[PDB]
Amino acid sequence: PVENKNQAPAPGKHYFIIENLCVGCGLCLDKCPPKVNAIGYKFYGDVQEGGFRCYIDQAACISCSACFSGDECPSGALIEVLPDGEVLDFSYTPPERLDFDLRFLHRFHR
Amino acid sequence: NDVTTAHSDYEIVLEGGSSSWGKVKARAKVNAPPASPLLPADCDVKLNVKPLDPAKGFVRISAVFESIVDSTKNKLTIEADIANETKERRISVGEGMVSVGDFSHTFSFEGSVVNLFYYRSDAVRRNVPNPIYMQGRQFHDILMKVPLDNNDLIDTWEGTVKAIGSTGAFNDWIRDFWFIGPAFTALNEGGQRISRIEVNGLNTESGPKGPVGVSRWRFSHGGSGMVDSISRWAELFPSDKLNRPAQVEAGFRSDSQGIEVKVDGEFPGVSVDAGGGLRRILNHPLIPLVHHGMVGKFNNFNVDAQLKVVLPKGYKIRYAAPQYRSQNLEEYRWSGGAYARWVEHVCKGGVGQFEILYAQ
Amino acid sequence: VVLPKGYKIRYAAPQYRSQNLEEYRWSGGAYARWVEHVCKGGVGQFEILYAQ
Amino acid sequence: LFGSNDVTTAHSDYEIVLEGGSSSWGKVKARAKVNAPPASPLLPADCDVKL
Amino acid sequence: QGIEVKVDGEFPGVSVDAGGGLRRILNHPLIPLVHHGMVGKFNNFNVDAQLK
Amino acid sequence: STKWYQIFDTEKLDDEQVVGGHLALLGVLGFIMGIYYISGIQVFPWGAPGFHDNWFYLTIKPRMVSLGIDTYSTKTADLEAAGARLLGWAAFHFLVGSVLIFGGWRHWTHNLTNPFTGRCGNFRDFRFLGKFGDVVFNGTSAKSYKEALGPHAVYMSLLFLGWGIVMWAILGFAPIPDFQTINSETFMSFVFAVIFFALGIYWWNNPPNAAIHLNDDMKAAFSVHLTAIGYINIALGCIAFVAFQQPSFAPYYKELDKLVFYLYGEPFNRVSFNFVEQAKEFADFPAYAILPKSGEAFGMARVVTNLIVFNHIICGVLYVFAGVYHGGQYLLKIQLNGMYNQIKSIWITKGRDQEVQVKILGTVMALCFATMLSVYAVIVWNTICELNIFGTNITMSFYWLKPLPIFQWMFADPSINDWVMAHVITAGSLFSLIALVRIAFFAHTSPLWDDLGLKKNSYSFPCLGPVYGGTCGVSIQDQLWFAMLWGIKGLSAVCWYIDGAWIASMMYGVPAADAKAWDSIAHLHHHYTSGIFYYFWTETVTIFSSSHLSTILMIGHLVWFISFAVWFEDRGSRLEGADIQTRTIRWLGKKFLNRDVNFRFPVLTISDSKLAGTFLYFGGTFMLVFLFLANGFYQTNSPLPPPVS
Amino acid sequence: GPWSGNAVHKAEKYFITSAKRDRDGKLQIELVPASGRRKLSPTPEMIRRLIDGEIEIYILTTQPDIAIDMNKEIIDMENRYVIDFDKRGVKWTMREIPVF
Ligand code: BCL
Ligand code: BCL
Ligand code: BCL
Ligand code: BCL
Ligand code: BCL
Ligand code: BCL
Ligand code: G2O
Ligand code: SF4
Ligand code: SF4
Ligand SMILES: [Ca+2]
């Protein structure tokens, strides 16, 4: 009989890099502001065999997190340590899955 | 004419910094009839929380339930002071008023809730990064006082005195009384088991303007992990995260033609740190999911849903499951597709997860 | 619904689809919605009130 | 026309190879692919059972 | 987005002898069906099912 | 990094946004069609001459002839009627395109308000029409692409029925089932309307489920539809080549050879240095006026047929490549998002196992290598035999190798040329499919990058550095560029075959002896224009004759060897050179400027350098292939005699 | 296979935090996976996984060195540390700040 009013428009930090893992691509350098210059190349030997790696100057590097948030690392050397101590290779790693294939017996994929 | 479709818009505006303090704006309309023998059923509920004292840890919450059912107006207003004494024990001091039609009774209450988890293993918290099913038990001890200022109310108190003093099985049937109708089913569909109550005291002292009936009683809620009150007790009460008066309005109107819902409000605790540096929009409490599925299974529907999560600037979503359809460079939008299937899932009682992980 | 003679439907959960003299017929969309509701366990009302 | 639109699809195959004679043995090979979301609060759940 | 179930098995109790010389595939245990019913009523679906 | 080619990316667009974009594009396309129709007016209805036969209109023309428009008439009155019909239909296209642009703007702004009735139409929920929408659907597709296929097919049925009606009333073509004559396309339009209405209602009542696309439709559905429509366009090109060669289309295409055309840029009558218009070659025509080019010698019928067929074919191949690239982008998105393990559909789960990817790509590589080696050895051996080096006459060549008699039905004159054409098309298809499969399967990790611990984290990352002495061009974008470069060969084979050329050998028709004796020993009633290398020499006669084609030649060549600069591994050299350029431009200081020169010379990113390189490479290559197909057909049905009896 | 989990790592990459040598040896040596959401202990089942090859634990450098001589003292190249003295363990090296 009686009802109340309604409206509803719905309907109608201290980042580190593991030189053992790093391969020296330098996208961290591109992700770093030029004013800081924290990422730097360190040369070890022949360039074609891996050669140079990259390093962070902890004093110069002040909590930008652009490198890791960009998630551009192919090698996973760009790691982030946390105040509690956990280490991150990637911002979000895919979950590990128990992989086993599906083949219907009567369907064409058997 | 035969098609029944649900049109819903959702907006989650998170705020920057460690504290979430998010705003939720939800609109919903569905053509399916409601599962209520009394129709039309209209309700307005206003929940406002205010920080009474940060040093004492006292928060103040006022809930105003205004409802119209079968042309009858009911109003349960309740102002309460919640205080976290310990991580297990919590205290409450409050006053309220229930006015149904011409009848109205005011109540006051002192209440201690002691929530104890059964298992405090470090192994589980060490292994599982996202604990959902946490069993436990909540012991409520409530001393509630009501002025016996009405003759019918006095009759109720007198009859209850004799009922308690006459039947020893009253502690079992009081659950049937308390869980009026389908509620008694829902507790079994949500993993909630309720122990027989214990009436510590049942006495009456008189105030100069009228008598006051005082009843102290205890009961034991028991959660098998699915219960939000037990498993998410810490996420339940973000008093430390609350410094600004938060508030939510929620009104749903249910004619036989359709149901219209509007829920607009800001509150803290929307996003919590799930570990790994990614803030997670909080896991869906499962009790609402199953209890709403109880009525949502009753009819089929087409799904037209749209969620618009407004991230604060500088943050990006790293995980969404299902994926967001469109992005406005700050707002992540889930419209249709597997999100529609998930909306169907949760409407009908599904407890599937919707992992929104976002980070700096 | 065939009423006693001299009575008419006044208030109704979703209204009657057809009305012959003394005969009311609920069909179509909303009544079918309610039927689908009660088949699956819906306890929603169908409040049919008739008066002289 | 029809009602209850926007349904998902589940594709299932079953095979029960029985053994003749007094032997009540059977070989059951079943496959299923359901596009409906699961009811797992911790959704990515893969379990292998070797009995 | 989905569920992928694969069962391979060899069971010694598939067939149950019945009266009159008849043998049958064993009656389905009902606890599986009912316990699956809780999760099976969460979405509307169409099934393409084969059995050999 | 949002670039100027990422602002219109679908990830930022909604469904309504792309609807508005498609409608704006349809309206702009209608405006362009009006331009072309106006450009086809041979004699103005005013009583004056018209436009000089644009290639756009020369392509459009036979289809217009199929309709009541655009009579193949030298009679001035009937040609004026043709111009009148063209202009009227152009104005109608202009009006409809204007309304379509208006609707596209409304859908771009998400501002859907009807001026006559002040109501807002919700994109998520509406009725298609006042009563028809309630008759058919009773509502709207619930914001899911799978649920929209039904209504989309219903709309396509409506469009087919409308096309039949337009043919019935305005163009005056009564539907009869005689498929040889024109007046059955309307009957088949009605048949397709019935069929697609049935399919649309079925798909509305029963939506097909491929749940991969629904979530991020903006890229998954885009990729699937783009690859499907690319194959559809390839099929349309093949069907067009077959049909335009049929006698049924002959009244509408062979008559194009009968009539001459005055093209824009076709050489004019040349006046002398002293022409007193108060000496001139070809004095009958006015000064600086276009000399007529005879269709019979130019082969305008097959020239237009080739333009149409190769336009659709290359557009389809490019659409296939772009569909694969965008599907790779979506797959990379779900691989970084962790949704790749959660797709649950055959189109992903089969490729989820890396060993299956290895097997598929290895089979493709083996087939490509075998077919390519076989056909290339055949080609080079034919070339060796016809040039007689190492003392081998053409009797040792692959002239015996005809297509099988069972398979001979689909060729005009069975020869080694058709064999090599088919083998080259299959080899190039597999050659591009190698890179397409690489995009499909190796969007995140190749088996090498699985063994060597790297992973692709972007769709447009340049490389991974000099580690392992490599890592260049492993991005799906770079694999797309390689696929395009590899399919350039296949598209070139298509163009040269449809234009007419001996693909089975390289120098066929050169003054060498056994190159000329090919036709004598092959028994062909068709004289193919020339061999692969001699094709340029034989077909550039007209390209040099026409100044306009020569201008296109020069511009395309410039574009190509400018692509060279960004294709090579020289970006760092260009960066340091640009720094030197900037330093000397700063040395314009103390050259009396007193102006701070804040202009750093820009050098493109490698992800942008490859983009520009491929765009310019393809652009120059096929700007020149346009001249290949615009030189002429020049195929005479006359076998060559042996040089020595 | 490779797509499940972090695609770089063949085995589950479990970095070792600097929990060390502060209270009766600190047997609760903190093992953290590349995902980083959980924080596990070095229980014998984790050692069973590690000897199974499904997981691989790695020691980092830029931290207080983790019982570097109490876990194992093989220092031929300063990275020959093994838990059960026949492990074939691998150490992650980071001369991050000390190098120029
Ligand atoms: C609901 C499931 C559980 C339950 C779980 C909890 C939880 C959870 C809490 C209490 C608490 C209380 N419980 Mg209890 N309790 C239940 C049944 C009861 C019954 C009864 C006979 O039905 C009684 C008398 C009590 C008694 C009481 C009080 C002693 C105390 C404060 C109540 C108050 O302020 O409410 C005021 C009234 C409301 C605000 C009305 C709306 C209630 C809903 C549940 C609020 C949901 C919030 C929404 C999702 C987000 C809102 C954002 C806003 C900005 C806040 N409980 C059942 C069995 N109980 C609190 C405490 O521990 O006190 C010390 C507490 O944290
Ligand atoms: C007396 C009630 C209890 C209590 C009981 C619960 C329970 C139980 C739950 C929450 C939940 C939440 N509460 Mg609480 N909570 C208490 C104290 C607080 C205080 C505070 C400082 O006072 C705050 C700020 C919050 C804030 C919050 C959020 C962190 C969270 C909801 C997240 C979300 O997005 O919701 C979205 C917002 C909504 C959908 C709006 C709902 C608005 C309506 C008016 C309230 C719900 C009505 C309910 C359906 C019906 C109640 C009828 C009963 C008969 C009373 N709670 C008090 C002490 N709260 C949920 C959560 O996830 O916990 C971890 C949950 O399960
Ligand atoms: C055969 C029909 C094809 C198709 C052909 C085209 C064409 C052709 C165009 C689009 C355009 C777009 N299409 Mg499409 N597209 C298909 C399928 C899809 C699907 C899908 C099924 O999921 C989606 C979501 C889209 C989405 C989109 C957007 C990226 C964009 C329109 C929105 C916008 O406002 O742009 C914002 C910008 C504008 C609308 C105009 C910008 C200026 C100019 C006109 C852009 C021209 C680009 C380029 C030169 C086009 C060349 C074609 C080649 C000559 C072969 N397409 C089907 C299968 N689409 C246009 C686009 O912008 O492409 C990048 C466009 O050019
Ligand atoms: C230029 C023609 C354009 C166009 C231009 C406009 C304009 C201009 C307006 C809309 C309006 C609307 N458009 Mg439109 N729109 C187009 C195609 C679409 C499509 C689609 C089929 O993919 C969609 C989803 C929409 C979406 C919407 C609706 C939400 C809304 C009308 C509400 C309704 O109930 O109207 C019932 C009818 C509709 C759903 C119309 C569907 C489209 C038809 C084919 C074209 C209508 C305009 C045309 C000039 C009139 C003659 C049509 C012929 C008789 C077929 N448009 C066509 C291709 N559209 C109107 C509005 O907001 O209304 C309140 C409005 O003002
Ligand atoms: C649509 C965007 C532009 C436009 C751009 C073009 C383009 C581009 C062309 C024409 C051409 C034509 N245009 Mg127009 N034109 C528009 C508006 C119109 C309208 C109108 C009232 O809207 C009409 C009646 C016409 C009229 C016509 C004819 C004179 C002519 C031949 C049509 C025909 O064969 O269709 C055939 C009709 C059908 C096949 C059925 C309807 C479409 C179906 C449902 C979609 C599937 C078929 C699709 C077109 C081809 C894909 C085949 C695959 C195998 C799936 N234009 C708008 C403004 N117009 C053509 C031209 O001049 O030829 C030389 C031409 O190619
Ligand atoms: C056949 C109809 C469509 C088609 C429909 C789809 C659909 C639908 C999907 C894709 C998707 C993808 N498409 Mg496709 N796609 C086609 C043509 C292609 C071609 C090509 C040049 O032939 C390529 C390289 C691609 C590339 C790709 C990838 C980016 C991606 C699949 C990755 C994967 O793991 O695959 C694993 C490989 C397979 C499953 C191969 C086997 C294919 C089928 C399922 C099995 C039977 C066919 C049999 C092998 C061949 C003989 C019989 C045929 C009838 C001829 N498409 C045609 C045009 N494509 C998916 C994606 O995510 O899009 C963004 C997606 O959703
Ligand atoms: C027409 C074609 C080309 C140019 C035009 C040109 C321009 C140019 N280039 Mg080039 N290039 C190739 C072709 C062309 N490169 C090829 C095919 C390769 C493959 C190997 C290649 C590779 C490298 C490497 C590796 C490096 C460079 C540079 C470098 C310059 C710096 C200054 C200089 O040399 O000026 C000398 C050059 C000029 C006088 C060029 C300007 C007018 C011009 C006369 C002709 C005008 C043509 C017109 C601009 C085209 C369109 C006009 C209109 C539509 C807008 C510089 C002006 C680099 C440096 O910056 O220092 C040298 C460097 O490191 N390259
Ligand atoms: S965190 Fe900031 S300062 Fe440190 S390397 Fe990254 S961008 Fe440079
Ligand atoms: S992105 Fe990774 S591989 Fe590249 S330089 Fe940085 S740490 Fe090294
Ligand atoms: Ca040519």
Residue numbers in the entry:
A (entry chain B): 4 to 15, 131 to 228
B (entry chain V): 7 to 366
C (entry chain W): 315 to 366
D (entry chain U): 3 to 53
E (entry chain U): 263 to 314
F (entry chain A): 58 to 335, 343 to 709
G (entry chain D): 21 to 120
Give the text the authors published on this PDB structure.
Upon illumination, the excitation energy is sequentially transferred from the chlorosome BChls through a monolayered baseplate, Fenna-Matthews-Olson (FMO) complexes, and ultimately to a membrane-embedded RC, where charge separation occurs. Because only one gene encodes two copies of the GsbRC core proteins (PscA subunit), the GsbRC has a homodimeric architecture with a symmetric distribution of pigments, suggesting two identical branches of electron transport chains (ETC) that could be equally utilized. Two membrane-associated PscC subunits (cytochrome cz or cyt c551) contain the cytochrome c domain, which mediates electron transfer from the menaquinol/cytochrome c oxidoreductase to the P84026–29. On the cytoplasmic surface, PscB binds two FeS clusters (FA and FB), serving as terminal electron acceptors.
The two-dimensional (2D) particle images were reconstructed into cryo-EM densities with different assembly states: RC-FMO2 (one RC core with two FMO trimeric complexes), RC-FMO (one RC core with one FMO trimeric complex), and RC alone, which showed the varied stoichiometries possible for the RC and FMO complex. The 3D cryo-EM densities of the RC-FMO2 and RC-FMO1 complexes were reconstructed at 3.08 Å and 3.49 Å resolution, respectively. When our RC-FMO1 structure was superimposed with the previous cryo-EM structure, no significant structural differences could be identified. Note that the FMO1 is the one seen in the RC-FMO1 structure as well as in the previous structure. In both RC-FMO2 and RC-FMO1 density maps, the two PscC subunits bind peripherally on both sides of the PscA dimer symmetrically. The cryo-EM density of the C-terminal heme-binding domain was resolved at a low resolution, and only visible at lower contour levels (1.0σ). These two low-resolution envelopes on the RC periplasmic surface can be identified in both our RC-FMO2 and RC-FMO1 densities. The MGDG lipids can be found in the RC-FMO1 structure, but not the BChl-A816 or PscF. PscF and BChl-A816 were not found in the RC-FMO1 or the previous cryo-EM structure, possibly due to their weak association with the complex. Because the PscE is associated with PscC and FMO2 but was lost in the RC-FMO1 or the previous structure, it likely plays an important role in stabilizing the association of PscC and FMO2. The FeS clusters and P840 dimer that drive the ETC in RC-FMO2 are arranged similarly to the RC-FMO1 and the previously reported structure.
